[PDB]
């Protein structure tokens, strides 16, 4: 499309061009308001619900200045978050880390969005004011003129909610005139009338205003909690006074008062100050109540996810934790539960009712006089506020608060997903217990014990060099059939010879199921035979999670790439590639079809906004890819690594593909970073954003290329700082040739430890480059060890990781006390009954837990191969075994000794009463 | 001309 | 030159003193058509050649495209420009822009009848020796096969083969009883919570249900066997 | 629009319902047979309140079933092309606005919506504001419309609306 | 061919009698009161819809807006759409219903519109 060409030609980061609202330069006034506004909403305002501090990497008021700087770099200099986080960290650290910078970037969108609506909405107010001014200058009790405070209310708005309040307010008082205003300006009229327009047609304005406090005055009495404005008192009874407004729509005084009270109730319910003051009070006092429907009482059993909260009474919203509210909305959409959010405590007690919020605020509008004249008005006033609170405000505030509590729970799930992805991408290449990379033999197999085990040998460069099929490696050495043993001996010898012929450094085995443990023991023994014979050095044997490898094998890419290889053997290669470099491997399952979402990050990841989750996951790729750096020559030479170019800061998928395409057309390796400018004609802003993150391995170059090779290209030193990097290297040697000086330091990096960078930072500041302490420390550390991999060194999975990896269970899905279905495998001598779960855990039922009555012979109750319901009592993660019981007293848990912990606010009375 | 001091220990 | 004015379509007059008059097609021919258009509330027939007629359709009726990118697909037109006639496909609520002259008008529903007789509606197939599935919608180059896991994958016409019915198979349900094939059951628990249907095929852990009232997934759905109750 | 006609239908009865209270038993099986169903001729039928009369029953030869033509009292809902009716907005998308007229869901493409209305896919509530941010049409809003076409899908209508015609908008 | 613009309906549906939103609201509410096999979710989605659009809820207000309009020379199609839409001006009623163009004068038609707006609860 033309847009792809425009993105390629435009000298701006691709993600800046793909942003919903285009990034526009900002004046210092806008940046200062934005910096304070973002700080208030994103960092200073605590979550309504209890949310875990997700900064796996309360920030003070000093953060406001740091945000102003960060916004300056993004909006005026067009630098992406990674560039700022790595090469402008002196200006944003320690208050803002890379995740905080993304948070600021995402909130900049919201600020720009709020300002855009707030500006056009102001234009509407200016047009409306001009139209009313024309009508008045060219008056009935119902003509309210739009004044300077009406404009100021809008200009002071701090959130989309307050903006919506001002908009709802504008529609209530002026919505009826909008079509008249537009036709007068030169369009056909939106026509429906809320009951408020009927009351206006009846002229009730003269009566509604006589209740006393104006909507705004009541708003201040609410805000200040006292009668700051005294209620004007009319000298007549309301029921007698209503006779003056009797018409065809309101034929009786009793009907006139209901109509007029409705008009007053709506004015109060839509006045911005009243909504603002109530919303604040509502978020602080709101209580959540939950009751199960006819369906919920039958379907929400002990195993259902809604078990801990199907009955809630008076739970403060401030006590909901993590994703719990999302689970509540899901159970409600499933029609299992009914949720109710009230500012009042629910109960039938007299004091309970006397203590309600309505009993508190009615006092701010009642006039304290005992005359019948005033008392009957107070009765009307009571019903005027009551209708405003019960019919308009409590329903709307409950919906708005419901959306915020739900949004916080959805955001938690997104943060939990990114936190899991981060923990996967942070793993470094396996290093044997190195310069030519590691030859890896990946071994994949299907869960069916009759399928052949497949091995794939991948060299350190990522090329598949060979493959092997083993029809009997799945058999067990202690089989009752001698034939199995004999046939397996040929495959054992085949693998031993394959290792002998190819000499791989590490063998990875698929975390498919518990049989992977047998495979590792056999592979370790084969390797141990080579070790005892001293025929080959010890070869690592690693259990590697195969979830990513399954997604690979099922991808369109894994078939097209290796058309002749079976699909099971295709998971053997991804397991070999995954241990070589997890980041390059995870980038393979990030296709245009969004295959990434098939990875099980969180049990609720399918219930969050898809676009928000995708952005939150790509941020984890962008964070790690830029920290690690992408070798362009590796990408051109090996199509496998081309997936990382799209995550390089500034490039993206359109420019990333284009970069490889031009180098492909020229058929030349990328020899130096300057070539991005001279051959790809890359503009200064895109070059600035990506140049520090693109690696060029100077050791791979030679011959005529020697004519121009900047050794610094082989490090994260940014080209803008090459002049300083050379000067810093020349001074460490105290030379009175920049390349010769640098080479001596790169080979002998210890000399840089004596160089005092603090003295040099003062000189750069004096020359006008500003504070450079952290940039110089990065350059010095980088020259001390070029491209030092900041990823966490690879480690073998622990007992907890192995158990979860092979059973595909988590502590939340497989907990002590849980009910389960299991198959009987045998009887232990009787000490108990041996069983096997679907997830492969081997369960054991002690004879004392077989039945409520003492059973001496288990054969009297259970048979081998029989399926039996049981309850987990103890879990042994190390042995893959669980102590199960099947006594009816335990199965039904008559003592409630095993059932999951109920919420603190669980309504035990409602649960007992519904029976 | 300017030179960074190696005064660091 | 060629002309595609099929019986039952609608054509208008592009030039002459009787311009802008949309009528229904009764007589069909080649170059010298001298068509007899049936306008609303008009028993008399006009006369127009092929060089004086245009394939036009008023906004809000079903259209069937013969040639184009999305050829062989049906839907509802919402805006008809000079050449881009956008419509809503009946399969998915998404845009679809095609040429009006290669279009035709039929008020019938897109049935998608079987050709040759190698497959039929609700027939068991064998994609891989490790997985099983049923055919639910016949396309022009591909087929919408629904596997045992419960998702619909898009395969070619020759990439799948007909599997023989396991009419002598049994499984377990929510009440832990012996449930066979060709029985009317109810799906109360599971992904398709609150559904009525008839089982046609069974497997190791899944059941292939079939309905007529449902429109989604060609009226067929798959759930686990332990998510069923006898109806 | 909602209409008023009393229709007739034929239902089958098994021998377990014979005996003296047969005609009384025939009435019950119709109440959950002609409710919430639909046709391309009478439209979507809401429900049956009472039953007028039971015709003569023909026993099927060989088996025990007998059919009974019954006349009943039901109210029906059929939207027609050219009608202007009210609806509630369910979803707003870049392709168009999707609404709901009682028992039926409908769609109006952005093509059929006036040129003033631009998109708001970026904000939390999906809306179509104007250049003036004046008339905002979002989810959960009582919006009038004009039906330009109907469609039947296995006993369910799915019509198509329009909104360029005048006096068709915000509540 | 079935087009409400020129008021053409199937022959078996042409003889039908139109119903007001408040009228079906009363008939549907009465059926719910009698039957709560229980009522279907299809029925509930007609209840909340005609509720939101039941402009007046007392039964006498239903029979009155119908009897006062049929006294004019409007069709029974207009008898329900002019009780559901509640247009403000006669030009709007003529824009919504094309059958009103040239059939009556604006001020008399406006009187019929005011008769309906005044009954709303």
Same domain, D65 and D85: no
| Chain A contact set for B4 (CB, 8 A) | 727-728, 731-732, 755-757, 759-760
Same domain, D127 and D67: no
Same domain, A111 and A199: no
Q: Does the beta carbon of A414 lie under 8 angstroms from any beta carbon of chain B?
A: no
Cβ within 8 Å, pair A160-D142: no
Same domain, D76 and D6: yes
> Cα–Cα–Cα angle for C197, C199, C205, nearest 5°?
120
Is residue A673 included in any domain, yes or no? no
Q: Is C163 annotated as a binding residue?
A: no
Same domain, A489 and A554: yes
Residues 6+ positions from A333 with CB-CB distance below 8 Å? none
Q: Which of A767, A784, A801 is the last residue of a domain?
A: A784
Cα(A323)–Cα(A411) distance, integer angstroms: 9
Q: Which of A640, A659, A678 is the last residue of a domain?
A: A659
Cβ within 8 Å, pair A191-E88: yes
Is residue A568 included in any domain, yes or no? yes
Name the residue facing A124 among D123, D132, D142 (closest C-beta).
Answer: D132
DSSP letter string, A47-68: PSSB----------TTHHHHHH
- What pairs with residue A540 in β-bridges? A506
Helices (H), chain E: 11-14, 21-35, 41-52, 59-70, 78-84, 90-96, 106-118
CATH number for A216: 1.10.3500.10
Cα(A375)–Cα(C197) distance, integer angstroms: 66
Cα(A573)–Cα(A456) distance, integer angstroms: 5
Element at A728 (helix H, strand E): helix A722-732
Same domain, D9 and D63: yes
Is the separation of the CB atoms in A38 and A107 below 8 Å?
yes
Phi, psi angles (nearest 5°) of residue C170: -135, 160
- DSSP one-letter code for C184: E
Q: Minimal Cα–Cα distance from B1 to chain A, Å?
A: 11
Structure tokens at A28: 């210092």
Of C137, C133, C140, give the one whose Cα is nearest residue C161. Answer: C133
Same domain, D90 and D109: yes
Structure tokens at A126: 């200016």
> Could you give the dihedral angle defined by the CA atoms of residues A208, A210, A214 and A218, in that order, rounded to the nearest 10 degrees?
-100
Cβ within 8 Å, pair A123-D132: yes
Is the separation of the CB atoms in C26 and C38 below 8 Å?
yes
Name the residue facing C60 among D148, D152, D154 (closest C-beta).
Answer: D148
Is residue A471 included in any domain, yes or no? yes
Is residue A528 included in any domain, yes or no? yes
Helix (H, G, I), strand (E, B) or coil at A261: helix
Is the separation of the CB atoms in A320 and A288 below 8 Å?
yes
Neighbouring C-beta atoms of residue A355, cutoff 10 Å = 13
Side-chain-side CA neighbours of residue E5 (13 Å) = 9
Residues 6+ positions from C177 with CB-CB distance below 8 Å? C230
Cα A677 vs. chain centroid, distance in angstroms?
37
Cα(A846)–Cα(A835) distance, integer angstroms: 11
Same domain, D71 and D117: no
Residues 6+ positions from A481 with CB-CB distance below 8 Å? none
Phi, psi angles (nearest 5°) of residue A846: -55, 145
Q: What is the CATH code for E1-121?
A: 1.20.1250.40
Cα(A408)–Cα(A328) distance, integer angstroms: 13
Radius of gyration of chain E measured on its C-alpha atoms:
16
Cα(A7)–Cα(A4) distance, integer angstroms: 5
Give the structural domain span for D1.
Answer: 1-80
Of A861, A862, A821, give the one whose Cα is nearest residue A843. Answer: A821
Structure tokens at C111: 């049935």
- DSSP one-letter code for A793: P
Cα(A213)–Cα(A309) distance, integer angstroms: 43
Residue of A nearest to E87 (CA): A191
Same domain, A119 and A172: yes
Structure tokens at A531: 């070790």
Cα(D169)–Cα(A189) distance, integer angstroms: 8
Of D65, D39, D18, give the one whose Cα is nearest residue D152. Answer: D39
First CA to last CA distance, chain E: 38
Cβ within 8 Å, pair D136-A167: yes
Q: Which of D45, D80, D115 is the last residue of a domain?
A: D80
Residues 6+ positions from A24 with CB-CB distance below 8 Å? A75, A112
Same domain, D131 and D171: yes
Element at C24 (helix H, strand E): strand C23-25
Helix (H, G, I), strand (E, B) or coil at C6: coil
Max distance between CA atoms of chain A, in angstroms, equals: 112
CATH number for A163: 1.10.10.650
Same domain, A647 and A739: no
Same domain, D34 and D44: yes
Of A333, A288, A336, give the one whose Cα is nearest residue A312. Answer: A288
Cα(A169)–Cα(A196) distance, integer angstroms: 13
Is the separation of the CB atoms in A499 and A539 below 8 Å?
yes
Q: Which of D17, D52, D80 is the last residue of a domain?
A: D80
Which residues of D fall below an 8 Å CB-CB distance to C? 81, 95-96, 98, 107, 109, 111-112, 148-149, 151-156, 160, 162
Helix (H, G, I), strand (E, B) or coil at A568: helix
Cα(A264)–Cα(A211) distance, integer angstroms: 8
Give the structural domain span for A493.
Answer: 440-659
Q: Does the beta carbon of D171 lie under 8 angstroms from any beta carbon of chain E?
A: no
CATH number for A487: 3.30.420.140
Q: Does the beta carbon of A198 lie under 8 angstroms from any beta carbon of chain E?
A: yes
Element at A85 (helix H, strand E): helix A81-87
Is residue A327 included in any domain, yes or no? no
Neighbouring C-beta atoms of residue C64, cutoff 10 Å = 17
Sorted by where each begins, the domain ranges of chain E are 1-121
Same domain, A118 and A147: yes
Helix (H, G, I), strand (E, B) or coil at A448: coil
Q: Minimal Cα–Cα distance from C193 to chain A, Å?
A: 9
Cα(A579)–Cα(A627) distance, integer angstroms: 19
Structure tokens at A327: 């689970």
Task: Give me the helix-helix angle, E21-35 and E59-70, nearest 10°.
Answer: 140
Element at A911 (helix H, strand E): helix A908-914
Cβ within 8 Å, pair D47-E4: no
Is the separation of the CB atoms in C228 and C186 below 8 Å?
yes
Strands C23-25 and D8-13: unpaired
Same domain, A155 and A201: no
Q: Residues in chain A, how many?
A: 915
* CA A232 vs CA A222, A229, A253, A382, A815: distances in Å: 17, 9, 22, 16, 65
Q: Does the beta carbon of E101 lie under 8 angstroms from any beta carbon of chain D?
A: no
- Range C206-221 burial, b when 16+ CB lie within 10 A, else e: bbbbbbeebbebbbbb
CATH number for A878: 2.40.50.140
Helix (H, G, I), strand (E, B) or coil at C82: coil
Is the separation of the CB atoms in D77 and D46 below 8 Å?
yes
Burial label, A708 (beta-carbon count in 10 A; 0-12, 13-18, 19+) = exposed
Same domain, A68 and A53: yes
Is the separation of the CB atoms in A444 and A510 below 8 Å?
yes
Is residue A850 included in any domain, yes or no? yes
Cα(A78)–Cα(E22) distance, integer angstroms: 60
- What pairs with residue A509 in β-bridges? A443, A543
| Chain D contact set for A192 (CB, 8 A) | 142, 144, 170-171
Q: Is C162 annotated as a binding residue?
A: no
Cα(D117)–Cα(D88) distance, integer angstroms: 18
Whether residue D156 is preceded by a cis peptide bond, meaning omega within 30 degrees of 0, is no
Give the experimental resolution in Å.
Answer: 3.8
Residues in chain E preceding a C-to-N separation beyond 2.5 angstroms (breaks): 36
Q: Which of D56, D80, D104 is the last residue of a domain?
A: D80
User: How many distinct structural domains can be found in chain A?
Assistant: 5
Phi, psi angles (nearest 5°) of residue D2: -70, 135
Place of tokens 């006045």: A271
- What pairs with residue A630 in β-bridges? A694
CATH number for D131: 2.40.50.140
Structure tokens at A705: 């290329």
Cβ within 8 Å, pair D1-E49: no
> Cα–Cα–Cα angle for D120, D124, D128, nearest 5°?
25
User: How many distinct structural domains can be found in chain D?
Assistant: 2
Same domain, A161 and A209: no
CATH number for D33: 3.30.1490.120
């Amino acid at each position: 499309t033309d847009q792809d060409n425009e993105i390629r030609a435009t000298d701006l980061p691709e993600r800046f061009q793909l942003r919903s609202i285009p990034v526009k330069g900002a004046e210092d006034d806008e940046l200062e308001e934005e910096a304070d506004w973002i700080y208030r909403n994103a960092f200073a305002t605590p979550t309504i619900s209890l949310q875990e501090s997700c900064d796996y990497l309360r920030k003070g008021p000093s953060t406001i200045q740091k945000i102003k700087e960060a916004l300056g770099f993004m909006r005026n200099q067009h630098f992406e978050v990674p560039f700022i986080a790595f090469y402008r960290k002196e200006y944003v650290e320690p208050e803002l880390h890379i995740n905080d910078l993304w948070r600021v970037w995402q909130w900049d969108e919201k600020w720009t969005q709020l300002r855009i609506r707030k500006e056009n909405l102001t234009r509407l107010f200016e047009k409306m004011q001009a139209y009313q001014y024309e009508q008045i200058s060219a008056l009935a009790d119902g003509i309210r003129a739009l004044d300077t405070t009406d404009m100021e209310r809008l200009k002071d708005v701090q959130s989309m909610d307050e903006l919506k309040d001002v908009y709802n307010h504008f529609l209530l008082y002026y919505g009826r005139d909008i079509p008249k205003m537009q036709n007068a300006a030169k369009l056909k009229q939106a026509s429906r009338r809320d009951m408020y327009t009927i009351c206006q047609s009846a002229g009730l304005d003269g009566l509604a205003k006589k209740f006393g406090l104006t909507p705004e005055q009541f708003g201040e009495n609410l805000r200040d909690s006292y009668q700051r404005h005294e209620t004007e008192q009319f000298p007549a009874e309301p029921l007698e006074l209503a006779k003056d407004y009797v018409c065809s729509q309101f034929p009786t005084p009793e009907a006139v008062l209901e109509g007029a009270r409705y008009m007053v109730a709506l004015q109060i319910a839509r006045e911005p100050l009243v909504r603002q003051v109530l919303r604040q009070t509502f978020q602080e006092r709101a209580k959540l109540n939950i009751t199960p429907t006819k369906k919920g009482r039958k379907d929400v059993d002990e195993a259902h996810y809604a078990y801990s909260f199907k009955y809630l009474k008076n739970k403060p919203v401030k006590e909901l934790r993590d994703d719990q509210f999302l689970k509540i909305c899901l159970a409600e959409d499933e029609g299992l539960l009914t949720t109710d959010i009230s500012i009042d405590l629910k109960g039938v007690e007299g004091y309970g009712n006397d203590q309600t919020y309505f009993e508190e605020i009615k006092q701010f509008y009642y006039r304290d006089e005992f005359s019948h004249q005033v008392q009957e008005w107070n009765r009307q006033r009571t019903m005027a506020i009551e209708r405003a609170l019960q019919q308009f405000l409590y329903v709307q505030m409950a919906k708005e608060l419901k959306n915020k509590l739900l949004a916080e729970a959805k955001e938690y799930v997104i943060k939990a997903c990114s936190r899991k992805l981060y923990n996967w991408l942070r793993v470094a290449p396996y290093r044997p217990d190195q310069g030519k990379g590691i030859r890896v033999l990946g071994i994949a197999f299907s869960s069916a014990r009759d399928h052949p085990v497949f091995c794939a040998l991948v060299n350190g460069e990522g090329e598949v060099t060979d493959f092997l099929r083993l029809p009997h490696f799945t058999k067990r050495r202690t089989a009752w059939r001698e034939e199995e043993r004999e046939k397996k001996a040929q495959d054992i010898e085949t693998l031993k010879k394959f290792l002998l012929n190819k000499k791989p450094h590490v063998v990875t085995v698929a975390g498919e199921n518990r049989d992977a443990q047998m495979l590792i023991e056999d592979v370790k023994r084969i390797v141990h035979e080579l070790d005892q014979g001293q025929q080959l050095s010890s070869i690592g044997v690693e259990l590697v999670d195969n979830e990513l490898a399954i997604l690979y094998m099922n991808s369109k890419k894994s078939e097209a790439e290796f058309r002749d290889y079976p699909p099971v053997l295709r998971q053997a290669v991804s397991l070999a590639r995954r241990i070589q470099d997890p980041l390059i491997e995870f980038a393979q399952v990030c296709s245009s079809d969004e295959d990434i979402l098939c990875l099980k990050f969180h049990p609720l990841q399918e219930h969050v906004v898809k676009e928000e989750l995708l952005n939150a996951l790509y941020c984890e790729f962008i964070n790690r890819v830029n920290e690690v750096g992408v070798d362009v020559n590796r990408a051109i030479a090996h199509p496998y690594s081309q997936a990382l170019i799209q995550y390089v800061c500034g490039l993206g998928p359109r420019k990333g593909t284009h970069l490889l395409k031009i180098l492909k057309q020229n058929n030349t390796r990328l020899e130096s970073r300057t070539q991005l400018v001279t051959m790809c004609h890359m503009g200064p802003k895109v070059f600035m954003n990506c140049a520090g993150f693109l690696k060029i391995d100077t050791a791979s170059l030679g011959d005529s290329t020697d004519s121009y090779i900047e050794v610094l290209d082989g490090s994260r030193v940014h080209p803008e700082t090459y002049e300083w990097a050379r000067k810093m290297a020349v001074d460490a040697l105290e030379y009175d040739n920049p390349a010769g000086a640098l080479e001596e330091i790169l080979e002998n990096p210890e000399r840089l430890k004596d160089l005092d960078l603090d003295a040099f930072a003062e000189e750069l500041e004096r020359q006008g480059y500003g504070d450079k302490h952290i940039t110089l420390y990065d350059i010095r550390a980088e020259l001390s060890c070029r491209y030092k991999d900041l990823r966490t060194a690879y480690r073998s999975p622990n007992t907890e990781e192995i158990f979860n990896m092979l059973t595909k269970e988590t502590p939340e899905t497989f907990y002590i006390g849980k009910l389960i279905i299991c198959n009987v495998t045998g009887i232990a001598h009787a000490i108990g009954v041996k069983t096997r779960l679907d997830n492969g855990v081997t369960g054991f039922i002690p004879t004392k837990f077989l039945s409520d009555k003492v059973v001496k012979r288990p054969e009297e109750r259970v048979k081998v191969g029989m399926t039996v319901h049981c309850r987990i009592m103890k879990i042994d993660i190390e042995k893959f075994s669980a102590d199960l019981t099947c006594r009816t007293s335990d199965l039904m848990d008559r003592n409630n000794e095993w059932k999951l912990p109920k919420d603190t606010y669980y309504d035990f009375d409602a649960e007992a009463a519904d029976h | 001309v300017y030179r960074i001091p190696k005064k660091s220990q | 030159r060629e002309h595609n004015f099929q019986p039952g379509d609608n054509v208008e007059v592009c030039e002459g003193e009787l311009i802008n008059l949309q009528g229904k097609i009764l007589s069909v021919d080649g170059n010298k058509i001298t068509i007899m258009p049936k306008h609303e509330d008009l028993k008399d027939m006009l006369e127009f050649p092929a060089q004086e007629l245009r394939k036009y359709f008023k906004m809000g009726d079903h259209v069937k495209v013969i040639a184009g990118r999305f050829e062989g697909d049906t839907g509802l037109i919402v805006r008809v420009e000079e050449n881009f006639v956008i419509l809503f496909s009946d399969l998915t609520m998404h845009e679809l822009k095609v040429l009006p002259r290669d279009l035709q008008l039929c008020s019938e529903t897109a049935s998608g009848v079987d050709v040759g007789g190698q497959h039929e509606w609700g027939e068991l197939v064998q994609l891989d020796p490790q997985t099983v599935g049923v055919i639910v919608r016949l396309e022009r180059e591909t087929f919408q096969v629904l596997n045992m896991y419960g998702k619909v994958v898009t395969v070619r016409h020759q990439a799948v083969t007909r599997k023989k019915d396991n009419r002598f198979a049994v499984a377990l349900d929510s009440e832990q009883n012996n449930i066979h094939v060709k029985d009317i059951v109810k799906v109360i628990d599971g992904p398709h919570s609150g559904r009525e249907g008839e089982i046609r095929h069974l497997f190791r852990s899944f059941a292939f249900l079939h309905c007529k009232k449902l429109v989604e997934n060609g009226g067929m759905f798959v759930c686990k066997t332990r998510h069923l109750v006898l109806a | 629009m909602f209409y008023h006609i009393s229709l007739e239908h034929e239902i089958l009865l098994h021998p377990r319902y014979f005996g003296p209270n047969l005609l009384n038993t025939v009435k019950q099986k119709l109440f959950t047979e002609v409710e919430g169903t639909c046709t391309g001729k009478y439209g979507f039928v809401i429900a049956v309140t009472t039953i007028d009369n039971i015709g003569a029953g023909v026993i099927q030869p060989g088996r025990g079933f007998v059919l009974y033509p019954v006349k009943y009292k039901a109210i029906v809902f059929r939207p027609f092309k050219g009608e202007v009716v009210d609806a509630v907005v369910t979803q707003v998308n870049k392709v168009g606005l999707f609404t709901e007229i009682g028992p039926m869901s409908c769609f109006i493409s952005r093509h059929s919506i006036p040129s003033e209305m631009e998109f708001d896919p970026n904000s939390n509530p999906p809306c179509y504001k104007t250049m003036d941010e004046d008339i905002v049409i979002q989810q959960d809003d009582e919006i009038r419309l004009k039906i330009v076409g109907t469609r039947v899908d296995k006993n369910d209508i799915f019509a198509i609306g329009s909104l360029m015609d005048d006096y068709l908008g915000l509540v | 061919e079935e087009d409400a613009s020129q008021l053409i309906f199937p022959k078996e549906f042409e003889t039908a009698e139109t119903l007001l939103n408040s009228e079906v609201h009363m008939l549907l509410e009465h059926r719910k009161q009698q039957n709560e096999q229980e009522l279907s979710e299809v029925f509930m989605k007609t209840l909340n819809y005609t509720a939101r659009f039941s402009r007046f809820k007392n039964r006498e207000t239903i029979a009155s807006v119908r009897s006062l309009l049929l006294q004019k020379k409007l069709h029974k199609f207009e008898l329900a759409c002019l009780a559901n839409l509640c247009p403000e001006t006669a030009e709007e009623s003529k824009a919504l219903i094309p059958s009103l163009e040239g059939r009556f004068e604006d001020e008399e038609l406006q009187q019929i519109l005011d008769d309906i707006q005044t009954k709303r609860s």
